[PDB]
Write a protein that binds this ligand. Structure first.
Ligand SMILES: [Zn+2]
Ligand SMILES: [Zn+2]
Lengths: 365, 117, 144, 112, 165
DNA sequence: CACTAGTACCTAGCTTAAGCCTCAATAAAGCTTGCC
DNA sequence: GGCAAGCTTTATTGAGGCTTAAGCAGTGGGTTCCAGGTACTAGTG
C-alpha cells in the first residue's frame, strides 16, 4: 500500500486475467458440498441430542438422512439457484448444433450483474489474448460478461503446494520464522499460493531450477506456474485450482525446441504411442498462464521471429503454436475471419450456435 | 536540502519525537513511552518535497537487466565496464510518466551499472 | 532523448501522443484519398457510395487501403500487460503496430495482433450499442 | 438431472490470497489494499481484509467481523509486537529511504 | 465522436449531456463557462494570459517547490546560512518554503503579493520574510508571532491547501 | 397383540430529495459599575 | 444605593453537513417449483 501511495508500483487492475480465477464444476460442487455435508452433520447432531436425553442409544442409519445431501445437489444442478444466492450456474445444455453444444460447455460467466452502465468489466482486455475468444460474446445485454473459452486454453485443476515447499526448503530458501528483518530487502520475497513462505537470495538459478523441473515433470506439475517479478524483488508460485493457461512452445537461445524428430515421432501416432503428453514431458511445450504471460517474450511465428533482421528483440522465450488457436469454437468455423470486420465475427459467433444441422449422432434415440 | 528519518529510542525502541530546550535553545529528541533524550543532528525536523525532483536511478535495481522483455541496445556502451549491450526502459512509476526518459542498465554480469541518457 | 518539446497546455507524453495520433491520422487520410482516386468509375463500392445508398468513403479506404488506428475509449490500445499491449511486443513499445495501428486492409487481412486490436475496437462499439438502449428509452419515457 | 442435461458454467471470481491495491476515488480513502484470503481445503468461505490509506495520511484496516476502522499499529501491537522499531522493521524493509518512513510516520503517531 | 488529444474540456455531448439537461442536475459531469474578453484583451494573447491567471484557482501547493520546517533559535544566524537573514535585525521553529521560478513566472506572481496574502489571511500571528530576485531560490521564511510545534505543520497543511492566491 | 403404512389434519452504481446532526448570531436575563 | 447603558450568560434559532428509497428500453420460448411433518388409525403379521 505504501508503494502504491508512492507509485513505485503501479496500481492493480480488476480486469487483468492474472487477477481472476475460474470456478469450474470442481470448486463449485465442492463449495456446494461443504454446506450440505455440514448440514448433514448438523442434522445428525440434532438426532443425537434427541436420542441421548431419552437415555437410549441412537440408530445411526436413521441419523444420516440422505435427502439433505442428494436432493440439495439435485436442486442446485436442476434449478441453478446456487444455494438453498446467485442463479444461472447450471444451464440447460444447448443441443441445436454440435457447435452450440461445444460452445455451451466452454462458456465463462463473469459474476458481474447485468444492466450496468459501466464498460470496464465488459471490454476486451489485453490479457484475453489466447485464453479466451475475442469475437464470441452474446451481443445482447451481456456483451463481454459471458465469454467463450479459446481452443487450446486449459484451466489448471490445481495441485497441492507441499512438494514445492519441500523443494524450496531443500534448496537454500530461508523461512520467515528464522530470518533477521535486515536481510529481507536485498533479496527476493517468495510466495506460494499467495502465502509468503520465505526469502531467497539468488533469484536467478532458482527460477532456472524451477523451470528445469517443469520441463521434466520431476516434482512440479506442468500446470503450476512460476512468476519472477524482476522490477520488484518478488517470486510467486501459483498452484491454485482455477487459473487459465495455454500451451506454448519453448525457445532456447533463438531456436525452437520443437525439432524434426518430434514431428517424426508425432506423425506416427497409434504406433509409437507418442502423445501430446510425451511432448510436454520432453520439455518442448509448456502451459503458460496469464500472470506468466506478463513476464514472457512470445514469438508469434518462428518463420519471422527467429531469423536475423534489423532485430526487434532477439530475446524470445516462448513461441505461439499457431495464432488461429486464439479463437473460440464458434469463431473457428469462420473462413477468413481476419478479413471480416469484428462485429461481423461476433454476430456470426452468435448465429453459428443457431444453425440447424445434425446436432448429435444418436438423435433418433 | 534532504529527507528526515525516524529516530529511535535506545531503551524501549519506540519513535523519538522532537521537542525544544527552554534552557539551551536546542532541539532534543524525546520518547513518550520512557523518558530518554538525545541531542538533535540537524534543524530540519520536517521536510516536504512537493515539486518531486527524485533521483530515479536509486529506484532502479541492477537485476532488471535479466528481464527478456526489455529491449536491448548495442548503441550505448556502459561508462564503467565498457560493455556494449544495455537494456533500456521508461520510468515505470507514478508521479512520473509525463516525460519519456530512458534509463539504461548494463546487462553485463557482475557490473550492473545503470545510468540516464 | 528529451529532444521533443512539450506543447503549451499538456504534458510531454500527451504532446507525444498528439504527434503520433496526428501522423497516423494523416497516414490514414492520405492512403484513404490515394485509394479512392483509383476506382475507374465502374467499381461498385463507388456505385453505392456516390449514390449514398450504402456505405461511405471510409469503407472504401478500409477495404482497399488500410483499416487504420484502432481505439479503445478514444485513445490507443492501452497497456494491459506490464508496460506492453500483448506479450509479443517488447516492453515500453509506443510504435504503430504495438499500440493498435492496423496497416493492413480487409482485402489483405489482419495479422493476429492486428486482429485482436481490431476485435477490441469492435467490442467497444458493441458495448456502446448494447448499453445505449435502456438509457435512451428511459429518456424518451420521461420526456413523453 | 431428471433427464435434463445440465452444464455448470464456469464462474469468474477475483483471485484469492492475493494482495491488490485499488483506488476508491469517490470514498474517503486514497488507496485501499485488499486480500481476499481463503485457505485451500477450508470449509469456511473467504474473508476479505482491507488495508486502506486515508485521503486528506493515516492507514487503517477493515478486519472481518469488526465494524470500526481499526488502525494498523493497533493490529501490529495486538500481534505481540510492542516496539515501533519492530513494527517498522516488518513494514518498511529498508531504513535508508526516509521518504517512506516519513509517510508511515502519521499512522505510527496515531496510536502511541 | 473521435476526440481531441489536446485539452478537449470533457464536453460529454450525447446521451449524458441530454440527461443532465432533462433531469436538472445540480452536479453536472462537466460544468464550464465561456468567458468572452472585453476589449484589447480579446485581441492580445498576453492580456488574455493575465485574465487567465486572474481567473484560475491558484493555491500555494501549485506554486511551491518544496517546504521544510526548522529549529533556528537565532534568526540572525540561520542553519541554512543564506543572505536575507539580516532583514530581521517570535518562535525558534520556522517554516522554510522554497518556490520554483517557473510557476511564479507563469502565474505572474511576486514574493510580496504572496506574503501580503498570507499576512491578510493570518493576521499578526504570522511573520513572513521573502527573498529578492537575486537567485532562482525563492525563499519564504515564516515564524509564529507572540499545538506547540506541530501547529506550524498544521498551518503548513492549511496553507498549502486553501490560500487562494 | 404388535409394526408399519396410508392418508388425513396442523403449521452495479448513480442521484436527489429528505429526514437527522452540529455550529454561529442574537435577543432575553441578569450582573455591573457609572452617573445621579 | 437606585436606575441604566453596557457586559456577560443563556437559550435560541436559523443555517451548514450525513444515510436512504427508487427509479433503471422493449417480445417470445424452455425449465423448475409450488407441503412437510406429525398423528391417528387399519390392515396385516
Ligand atoms: Zn523511548
Ligand atoms: Zn556496466
Amino acid at each position: 500500500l505504501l508503494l502504491a501511495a508512492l507509485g513505485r508500483r503501479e496500481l492493480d487492475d480488476r480486469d487483468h486475467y492474472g487477477n481472476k480465477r475460474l470456478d469450474l464444476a470442481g470448486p463449485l460442487l465442492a463449495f456446494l458440498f461443504r454446506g450440505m455435508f455440514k448440514n448433514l452433520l448438523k442434522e445428525v447432531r440434532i438426532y443425537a441430542q434427541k436420542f441421548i436425553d431419552r437415555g437410549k442409544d441412537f440408530n445411526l442409519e436413521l441419523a444420516i438422512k440422505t435427502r439433505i445431501i442428494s436432493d440439495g445437489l439435485k436442486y442446485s444442478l436442476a434449478t441453478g439457484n446456487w444455494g438453498d444466492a446467485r442463479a444461472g450456474v447450471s444451464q440447460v445444455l444447448n443441443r441445436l448444433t454440435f457447435a452450440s453444444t461445444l460452445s455451451h460447455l466452454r462458456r465463462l460467466n463473469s459474476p458481474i450483474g447485468r444492466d450496468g452502465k459501466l464498460a470496464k468489466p465488459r471490454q476486451l482486455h489485453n490479457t484475453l489474448w489466447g485464453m479466451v475468444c475475442p469475437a464470441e460474446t452474446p451481443e445482447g445485454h451481456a456483451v463481454g460478461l459471458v465469454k467463450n473459452l479459446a481452443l487450446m486454453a486449459y484451466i489448471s485443476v490445481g495441485s497441492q503446494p507441499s512438494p514445492i515447499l519441500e523443494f524450496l526448503e531443500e534448496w537454500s530458501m530461508e523461512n520467515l520464522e528464522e530470518i533477521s528483518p535486515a536481510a529481507i530487502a536485498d533479496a527476493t520475497k517468495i510466495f506460494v499460493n499467495g502465502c509468503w513462505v520465505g526469502i531467497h537470495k539468488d533469484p536467478e538459478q532458482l527460477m532456472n531450477t524451477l523451470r528445469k523441473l517443469r520441463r521434466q515433470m520431476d516434482i512440479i506439475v506442468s500446470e503450476v506456474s512460476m512468476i519472477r517479478d524482476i522490477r520488484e524483488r518478488e517470486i510467486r508460485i501459483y498452484t491454485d485450482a482455477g487459473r487459465i493457461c495455454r500451451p506454448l512452445l519453448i525457445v532456447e537461445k533463438q531456436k525452437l525446441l520443437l525439432k524434426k524428430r518430434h514431428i517424426d515421432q508425432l506423425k506416427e501416432r497409434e504406433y509409437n504411442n507418442y502423445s501430446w503428453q510425451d511432448l510436454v514431458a520432453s520439455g518442448v511445450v509448456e502451459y503458460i498462464d496469464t500472470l506468466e504471460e506478463e513476464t514472457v517474450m512470445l514469438a508469434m511465428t518462428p518463420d519471422d521471429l527467429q531469423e536475423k533482421e534489423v532485430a526487434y528483440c532477439s530475446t524470445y522465450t516462448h513461441c505461439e503454436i499457431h495464432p488461429s488457436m486464439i479463437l473460440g469454437v464458434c469463431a473457428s468455423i469462420i473462413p477468413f475471419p481476419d478479413h471480416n470486420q469484428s462485429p461481423r465475427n461476433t454476430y456470426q459467433s452468435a448465429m453459428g450456435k443457431q444453425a440447424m444441422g445434425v446436432y448429435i449422432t444418436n438423435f433418433h434415440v | 536540502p534532504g529527507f528526515v528519518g525516524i529516530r529511535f529510542c535506545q531503551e524501549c525502541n519506540n519513535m523519538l519525537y522532537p521537542k525544544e530546550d527552554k534552557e539551551n535553545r536546542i532541539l532534543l529528541y524525546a520518547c513518550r513511552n520512557c523518558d530518554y533524550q538525545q541531542e538533535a543532528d540537524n534543524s530540519c525536523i520536517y521536510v516536504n518535497k512537493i515539486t518531486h525532483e527524485v533521483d530515479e536511478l536509486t529506484q532502479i535495481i541492477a537485476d532488471v537487466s535479466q528481464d527478456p522483455t526489455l529491449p536491448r541496445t548495442e548503441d550505448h556502451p556502459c561508462q564503467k565496464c565498457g560493455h556494449k549491450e544495455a537494456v533500456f526502459f521508461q520510468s515505470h512509476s507514478a508521479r512520473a510518466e509525463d516525460a519519456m526518459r530512458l534509463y539504461y542498465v548494463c546487462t553485463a554480469p557482475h557490473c550492473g551499472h545503470r545510468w540516464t541518457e | 532523448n528529451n529532444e521533443l518539446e512539450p506543447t503549451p497546455g499538456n504534458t510531454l507524453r500527451q504532446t507525444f501522443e498528439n504527434q503520433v495520433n496526428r501522423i497516423l491520422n494523416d497516414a490514414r487520410d492520405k492512403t484513404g484519398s490515394s485509394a479512392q482516386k483509383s476506382l475507374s468509375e465502374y467499381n461498385n463500392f463507388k456505385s453505392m457510395v456516390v449514390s449514398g445508398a450504402k456505405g461511405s468513403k471510409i469503407n472504401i479506404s478500409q477495404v482497399i487501403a488500410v483499416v487504420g488506428q484502432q481505439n479503445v475509449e478514444g485513445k490507443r490500445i492501452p497497456f494491459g500487460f506490464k508496460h506492453r499491449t500483448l506479450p509479443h511486443f517488447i516492453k515500453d513499445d509506443y510504435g504503430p503496430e504495438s499500440r493498435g495501428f492496423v496497416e493492413n486492409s480487409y482485402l489483405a487481412g489482419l495479422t493476429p495482433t492486428e486482429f485482436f486490436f481490431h476485435a477490441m475496437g469492435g467490442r467497444e462499439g458493441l458495448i456502446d450499442t448494447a448499453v445505449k438502449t435502456a438509457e435512451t428509452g428511459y429518456i424518451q419515457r420521461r420526456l413523453i | 438431472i431428471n433427464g435434463s442435461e445440465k452444464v455448470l458454467i464456469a464462474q469468474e471470481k477475483m483471485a484469492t490470497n492475493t494482495v491488490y491495491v485499488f483506488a476508491k476515488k469517490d470514498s474517503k480513502y486514497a488507496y485501499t489494499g485488499e486480500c481476499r484470503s481463503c485457505l485451500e481445503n477450508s470449509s469456511r468461505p473467504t474473508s476479505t481484509i482491507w488495508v486502506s490509506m486515508l485521503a486528506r495520511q493515516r492507514i487503517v484496516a477493515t478486519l472481518p467481523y469488526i465494524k470500526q476502522e481499526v488502525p494498523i499499529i493497533i493490529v501490529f501491537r495486538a500481534l505481540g509486537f510492542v516496539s515501533d522499531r519492530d513494527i517498522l522493521e516488518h513494514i518498511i524493509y529498508d531504513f535508508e529511504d526516509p521518504e517512506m518512513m516519513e509517510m508511515v510516520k502519521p499512522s505510527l503517531d496515531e496510536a502511541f | 465522436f473521435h476526440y481531441a488529444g489536446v485539452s478537449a474540456k470533457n464536453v460529454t455531448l450525447g446521451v449524458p449531456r441530454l440527461k443532465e439537461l432533462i433531469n436538472i442536475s445540480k452536479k453536472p459531469k462537466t460544468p464550464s463557462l465561456t468567458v468572452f474578453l472585453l476589449g484589447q484583451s480579446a485581441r492580445d494573447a498576453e492580456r488574455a494570459k493575465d485574465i487567465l491567471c486572474r481567473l484560475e484557482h491558484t493555491t500555494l501547493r501549485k506554486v511551491t517547490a518544496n517546504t521544510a520546517i526548522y529549529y533556528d533559535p537565532n534568526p540572525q544566524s540561520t542553519v541554512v546560512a543564506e543572505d536575507q537573514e539580516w532583514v530581521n535585525v517570535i518562535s525558534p521553529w520556522l517554516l522554510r518554503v522554497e518556490l520554483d521560478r517557473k510557476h511564479m513566472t507563469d502565474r505572474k506572481l511576486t514574493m510580496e503579493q504572496i506574503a501580503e496574502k498570507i499576512n491578510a489571511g493570518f493576521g499578526d500571528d504570522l511573520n513572513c520574510i521573502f527573498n529578492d530576485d537575486n537567485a532562482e531560490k525563492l525563499v519564504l521564511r515564516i515564524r509564529i508571532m507572540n499545538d506547540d510545534d506541530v501547529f506550524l505543520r498544521c498551518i503548513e497543511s492549511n496553507m498549502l491547501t486553501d490560500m487562494t492566491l
